[PDB]
């Protein structure tokens with residue numbers, strides 16, 4: 001345990017808020033990449049007990065707090081009010097580095113599941129560039145698995161524990177509010193999604209001998225977690241996944257039961273001003289959406305699931321740390 | 336004819352050479368492009384005399400020139416030496432866009448062969464995302480035909496002209512030099528390849544009356560064209576295809592006479608330092624291969640063939656312009 005420090009390629013002439021924050025919070029990244037090779041080093045990891053996740057979480061909280069400032073912030077019953085200007089928002093990769101004395105263990109097993117033994121393990125000073133993407137249900141712009149889909153869970157037998165699905169082939173998603181000014185929609189191709197949920201369904205069938213594996217929408221709760229919520233250009237998108245997380249995996253094949261037209265799934269999205277926040281319990285209220293075409297072209301690189309002779313899985317997260325665990329699972333700070 | 340300009344999602348923080356080049360050579364992408372489809376039009380295309388293919392060839396030559404710098408560059412008695420560092424190498428899609436005053440026509444007939452008339456034509460800003468993949472015999476990471484395999488040739492009855500086979504179902508190929516340090520090998524499933532060469536065999540059988548259609552290895556020449564040669568992580572792979580392009584299509588069925596084990600075709604590959612070049616006549620010499628596992632997991636999306644009772648087809652390419660024609664066949668720059 002120590003106090004890590006961030007490193008980025010943050011340009012100081014960029015008024016994009018991630019850069020504005022990183023230039024006065026992080027230090028320029030390192031060319032010196034002496035990844036210390038190894039083998040014969042059996043060591044154990046637990047992606048669900050890592051501190052790196054906590055530190056990252058709190059500094060992304062500080063980032064958001066200084067960058068995305070709401071008109072109104074309502075917490076504990078008290079309402080704080082401030083200026084709410086529209087800002088430039090597009091996440092940049094952050095490297096997390098260990099200070100003088102400690103290093104960073106890095107699992108190299110391409111099929112390591114976050115929890116337990118690994119031993120193709122290296123030693124490096126800073127982590128890989130990680131985009132602080134705040135989202136629910138879907139993980140956007142992350143690192144793809146180095147082949148075969150990996151199932152992650154602090155516990156799979158615990159239906160209360162969030163499941164992280166690390167994908168190996170990215171699935172593009174294009175969300176847009178065109179030029180109702182809060183009416184938006186996302187486009188995702190059906191074939192890559194069918195393929196994705198079939199392979200994922202197989203990997204799930206692996207850990208669950210073989211019962212009927214269903215993919216159903218979220219149970220309930222706040223709009224943030226019942227929908228794919230995310231941030232695009234400062235604007236908060238709540239996109240629907242009822243025709244996304246929809247289908248049945250049985251006897252080796254997956255059949256999608258969601259609606260579609262001409263091979264493209266369209267999610268119904270709404271931009272909301274009243275957001276809860278992910279930082280703390282409370283909650284923010286922002287200004288109405290900017291004018292003009294608001295579009296984000298992002299890569300789905302992961303899933304957040306919750307399990308209920310049939311195993312049902314729903315999109316889950318809301319917490320985020322889990323988002324950070326999705327990329328910080330292979331690391332462990334060491335003496 | 337105009338002077339096109341490139342567009343890409345190149346990352347300025349990425350030290351991968353395609354990104355390094357594109358960030359200072361290309362402009363940011365259109366993240367939600369709008370195409371204008373037309374009726375009552377019948378337009379002529381010729382994928383074999385398009386200037387886009389050239390301009391792209393030029394810019395990929397520049398890209399390679401600044402990115403992959405060799406130990407020695409020999410060219411008839413005169414040899415140049417310079418620093419030849421190992422780099423991060425992984426191609427990214429390049430869109431090609433027409434300037435102001437010009438536009439790009441796009442044939443939407445998906446059985447269009449690249450030469451002659453097509454009538455469902457659209458008009459658009461920039462081309463689709465094209466990975467500048469340099470290879471011979473096999474086309475990798477291309478766009479698949481929107482189904483039913485397409486045969487392309489400036490002429491089929493001229494045996495001296497290169498034939499581009501556009502597949503519609505990708506055939507995975509996994510090349511690897513495991514942790515002899517220049518000894519590598521590729522893996523291809525024989526089922527997928529048998530089915531593929533049967534379909535291709537049939538499509539060739541329609542263009543050629545009723546002859547025994549054989550697939551045989553390359554006649555001869557430099558290792559770059561007598562083998563499937565490509566670039567994986569900066570290393571130049573020369574992979575053998577004598578057990579791949581080996582079969583006999585007759586009486587409506589294809590038979591693989593090539594070798595296999597447990598349903599798997601394994602190509603013998605070697606990483607070479609003495610390359611050759613494709614850009615110009617001459618060569619380049621490079622540093623010995625990097626250490627560790629060097630593996631490329633690619634999708635075969637096209638074939639490059641040459642025709643010699645029987646019609647014999649051999650793997651051909653070395654020019655790459657054909658590799659850019661495989662993707663730029665559907666386009667034409669217009670006033």
Ligand SMILES: CN(Cc1ccc2c(c1)C[C@H](CNC(=N)N)[C@H]2NC(=O)C(=O)Nc1ccc(Cl)c(F)c1)C(=N)N
Nearest residue numbers: 134135136224229230231276277278280281282318319
């Ligand atoms: C409660 N629970 C798990 C759980 C469920 C929901 C939440 C959390 C935790 C943390 C957040 C609560 N904070 C709040 N202000 N409501 C809340 N998470 C969020 O409000 C949240 O992520 N919001 C959000 C905001 C903006 C974007 Cl762009 C987004 F994608 C999500 C459980 N397992 N019992």
Ligand SMILES: CN(Cc1ccc2c(c1)C[C@H](CNC(=N)N)[C@H]2NC(=O)C(=O)Nc1ccc(Cl)c(F)c1)C(=N)N
Nearest residue numbers: 469470471559564565566611612613615616617653654
């Ligand atoms: C000669 N000819 C057709 C023909 C045949 C071979 C070649 C060319 C053309 C161009 C390249 C010649 N340049 C050279 N330095 N030898 C040469 N092409 C190549 O050297 C070539 O593609 N090399 C190469 C280098 C790296 C990778 Cl990865 C690769 F896949 C191929 C014909 N039809 N009569």
